[PDB]
Amino acid sequence: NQAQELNHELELEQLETKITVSSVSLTGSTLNVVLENNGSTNLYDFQGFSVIVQYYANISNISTFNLSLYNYTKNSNPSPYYWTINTPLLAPGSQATLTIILPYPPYPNTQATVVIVTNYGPSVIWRGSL
């Protein structure tokens, strides 16, 4: 059966997919997350990823909760609410830099949560200070 074989393949890829955050670094409104592929699947369908960031924006010197979803773009100079990555395919064992364009600079030394979801389902959450 075809739905059986599709679900078989898909679940194996979910089992085989894994990503972690090596580091996070901020410059202005630009958030650069170094992501490593600790699975055995290739990752390249970035239009099927999710990137969600909850952080505290500096708005006229007021620390202001912000929660937004960021859309992927091939464009190397992305607009606010967009993200991109400096590789066309992230192979097992490799790392890449995922660049997220925040709408406002983070308020200094505030907590933030970055959620990165592969197109297969498996994800990673990073919590820390910006």
Binding site: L10, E11, G48, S50, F65, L67, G121
Partner: protein, 115 residues
């Protein structure tokens, strides 16, 4: 003598998931619903949404205009896409209780997120 609840050896196919959910104020809740399966899910307005403190979830009505109600950014969800669910609450959330949102698509697929 080592004991562990559930097991990370036992797994099943995920076709649908809430990537993240949290309150964005005292009276508003946002959830990101991600179709990681392979078929488009249609008529999400006919989903059923429940939300409440852990163990006390209440049903939430679609797009009523008066709390408690929920909205969705699109009435269908294609493979790999995300939609944004918003719940407008009548009473404010507490900083101590944990809350669960649960979504049941018309096809019955049931997902939850706790925060």
């Amino acid at each position: 003598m080592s004991s562990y609840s559930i097991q990370q050896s036992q797994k099943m196919l995920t076709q649908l998931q809430i990537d993240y959910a949290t309150n964005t104020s005292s009276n508003t809740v946002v959830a990101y619903l991600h179709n990681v399966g392979e078929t488009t899910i249609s008529y999400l307005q006919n989903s059923v949404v429940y939300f409440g403190p852990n163990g006390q979830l209440q049903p939430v009505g679609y797009n009523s205009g008066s709390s408690p109600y929920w909205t969705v950014t699109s009435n269908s969800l294609q493979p790999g896409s995300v939609v944004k669910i918003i719940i407008y609450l009548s009473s404010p959330l507490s900083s101590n209780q944990y809350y669960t949102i649960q979504i049941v698509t018309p096809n019955g697929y049931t997902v939850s997120y706790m925060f």
